[PDB]
């Protein structure tokens, strides 16, 4: 009856909002490209507060954290490649021969022994040096003359070899007055009302791994193997599957390389590939045929729920495009592998090994181009020794064609971050609340 | 006792969550120019701005340093005709803001002048 307005400060009510999310990291100290030393240390007690009775709406396909991480990672790379060497003198006519013939037909030319004239510390005196270049990084002229692949499109910048391309888990945090909402639903689709919700100040550790087709070193599902797409009935929307069991992959570049520093000027030093100690072998990846067949069947079962128990789905290899998207391209110890995946997506499944593994023939690039703008590329300096990384495959990036056929791909860098930021959402706190009661001032 | 944590009573009734206001009150506020450094500086200036806008409104209403202040603005039933028991023992603060959202600007003015006139009345009473 006698009701007046009463103001409350600190009411549990929030609205959806976009804000700047700062990074948190764990104490590890050289320096990585992700500048994880420049982040605030994460609390050793990552507080999670469960929001009982709360049901929130999520939409990973409109989430801004994936749009903010997509640009932060690009900025972290632009920042790290800023003070490094500009290899513009490397855009010169190369005299190339095969290095060490008699291997296996079209394999001597996969990497070349290229010699070229180069500037020195004195601008008036040249030097004739040589370097081992992979075939994917050079093109002919039409004689045995070659040039770097990037010279007619993009400038080139070699990474400061003291920086590490190793991904370090990143914790995105919301500023004070904001909150991160986690959808703790074990069988969550990515959109819609999430019944179990908790709030956190910072997200979990998110390694900024940029792979293709296969999602590496990611987070796993707790139940079944979920499948996420905004319009699954649309064939042009990438399907982002996420395993619950990690199917291990073993990649290696067995060639024992040597890095030969070449001074291209005062202070500037281009790191060439000296020679190969030992055998000239082929880089490849192993994945247990048994575990991959088992995990490929789980995806089939969860794909039946969107296309019928009776339909037949088929896995085919990539249908074309750039090199980074037709292969399982990724980074392993510094070198950038490009793995043929025809041996992983070559299976048809009906309506209703056990010892060996399936190997993946991988090629290697050094002049890797930029994924966004054109006119820019990076020279990955050669890594000495033998490279062999062991990583988990926790998801895929498939694509339907409109009985059913699924091929992989995904050159978009933000699809990787959707696979880890799907369960998070940014909201702003509005602690002012007016409501009636029979209370009056004075 | 209970202590549900920060926003722990977001799904609780308005009368229940109205007893855990200090929980949300203390979490509303707690240089190299790198990509992370610029990011963190923006998070710092934004937090102090949002915190002081609410403290400003809390000041022009005569509610400085109050979690629960009572006003003199009567409840126009056109805002919400719901009774007290079906509000504090029923609704949550989230859905309450959802149906009072249209009139939140109307109320913010009535509280602003009720405080301006009250302090003018208090000066007249202490003038003797």
């Amino acid at each position, epitope marked *: 009856e006698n009701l007046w307005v009463t103001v409350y400060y600190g009411v549990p009510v929030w609205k959806d909002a976009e804000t700047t999310l700062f990074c948190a990291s764990d104490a590890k100290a050289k320096h990585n490209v992700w500048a994880t030393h420049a982040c605030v240390p994460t609390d050793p007690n990552p507080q999670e507060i469960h929001l009982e*009775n709360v049901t929130e709406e999520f939409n990973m396909w409109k989430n801004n954290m994936v749009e903010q991480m997509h640009t932060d990672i690009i900025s972290l790379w632009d920042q790290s490649l800023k003070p490094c060497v500009k290899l513009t003198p490397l855009c010169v006519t190369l005299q190339c021969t095969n290095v060490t013939n008699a291997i296996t037909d079209d394999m001597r030319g996969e990497l070349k022994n290229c010699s070229f004239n180069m500037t020195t510390e004195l601008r008036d005196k040249k030097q004739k040096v040589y370097s081992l270049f992979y075939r994917l990084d050079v093109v002919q002229i039409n004689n045995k003359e070659y040039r770097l692949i990037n010279c007619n499109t993009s400038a080139i910048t070699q990474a400061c070899p003291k920086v590490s391309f190793e991904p370090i888990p990143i914790h995105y945090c919301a500023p004070a007055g904001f909150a991160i909402l986690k959808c703790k639903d074990k069988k969550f689709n990515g959109t819609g009302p999430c019944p179990s919700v908790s709030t956190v100040q910072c997200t979990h550790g998110i390694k900024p791994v940029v792979s293709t087709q296969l999602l590496l070193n990611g987070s796993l599902a707790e139940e079944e193997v979920m499948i996420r797409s905004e319009n699954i009935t649309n064939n042009a929307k990438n399907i982002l599957v996420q395993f619950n069991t990690p199917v291990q992959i073993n990649c290696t570049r067995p060639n024992n390389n040597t890095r030969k520093s070449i001074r291209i000027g005062p202070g500037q030093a281009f790191y060439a590939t000296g020679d190969i100690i030992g055998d000239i072998r082929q880089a490849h990846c192993n994945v247990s045929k048994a575990t991959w067949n088992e995990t490929l069947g789980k995806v089939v079962k969860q794909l039946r729920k969107h296309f019928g128990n009776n339909t037949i789905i088929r896995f085919a290899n990539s249908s074309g495009g750039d090199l980074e998207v037709t292969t399982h391209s990724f980074n392993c110890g510094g070198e950038f592998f490009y793995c043929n995946t025809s041996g992983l997506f070559n299976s048809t499944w009906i309506s209703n090994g056990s010892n060996d593994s399936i190997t993946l023939p991988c090629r290697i690039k050094q002049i890797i181009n930029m994924w966004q703008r054109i006119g820019q590329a990076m020279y990955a300096p050669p890594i000495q020794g033998v490279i062999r990384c062991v990583s988990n495959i926790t998801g895929l990036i498939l694509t339907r064609d409109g009985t059913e056929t699924f091929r992989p791909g995904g050159g978009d860098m933000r699809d990787n971050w959707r696979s880890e930021l799907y369960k998070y959402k940014v909201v702003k706190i509005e602690p002012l609340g007016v409501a009636p009661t029979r209370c009056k001032r004075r | 006792a209970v202590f549900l944590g920060f926003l722990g009573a977001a799904g609780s009734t308005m009368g229940a969550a109205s007893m855990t206001l200090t929980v949300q009150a203390r979490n509303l506020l707690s240089l190299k120019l790198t990509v992370w450094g610029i990011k963190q500086l923006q998070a710092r200036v934004l937090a102090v701005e949002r915190y002081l806008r609410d403290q400003q409104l809390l000041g022009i209403w005569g509610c400085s340093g109050k979690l629960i202040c009572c006003t003199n603005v009567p409840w126009n039933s056109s805002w919400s005709n719901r009774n007290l028991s079906e509000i504090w023992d029923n609704m949550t603060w989230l859905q309450w803001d959802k149906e009072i959202s249209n009139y939140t600007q109307i109320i913010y003015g009535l509280l602003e002048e009720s405080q301006n006139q009250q302090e003018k009345n208090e000066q007249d009473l202490l003038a003797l």
Partner: nanobody, 128 residues
């Protein structure tokens, strides 16, 4: 809003055990109790018992202490404040003297002294 569609009005004979369904809509099914009320012809209307779709805690009259099984399945979130639920009712040593119209009614408020009070009822089901 809120709806509570009930099952069919079929009939059986003594000694059996029928199940009554009550499907909810337009309100968070977990926030209010579900009551079962009986309007017999040879007796005044009787309150059989309520159950909590949130805590699973049930409470029935001693006249139905060991003869009635009340169960509810978890809800399905529709929006932030809308879900769909279902409540089930059973009888054990059943005769033909329990004939009448059976209703399901959700609780009144979420807190206070009239929490479980049957507020929003269903359309009822005729029995044997």
């Amino acid at each position: 809003q809120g709806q509570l569609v009930q099952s069919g009005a079929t009939t059986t004979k003594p000694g059996s055990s029928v199940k009554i369904s009550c499907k909810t809509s337009g309100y968070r099914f977990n926030f209010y109790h579900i009551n079962w009320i009986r309007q017999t012809a040879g007796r005044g209307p009787e309150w059989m018992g309520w159950i909590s779709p949130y805590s699973g805690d049930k409470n029935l009259a001693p006249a139905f202490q060991d003869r009635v099984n009340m169960t509810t399945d978890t809800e399905v979130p529709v929006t932030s404040f809308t879900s769909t639920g279902a409540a089930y009712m059973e009888i054990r040593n059943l005769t033909s003297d329990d004939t009448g119209t059976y209703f399901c009614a959700k609780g009144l408020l979420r807190d206070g002294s009239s929490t479980w009070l049957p507020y929003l009822w269903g359309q009822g089901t005729l029995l044997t």
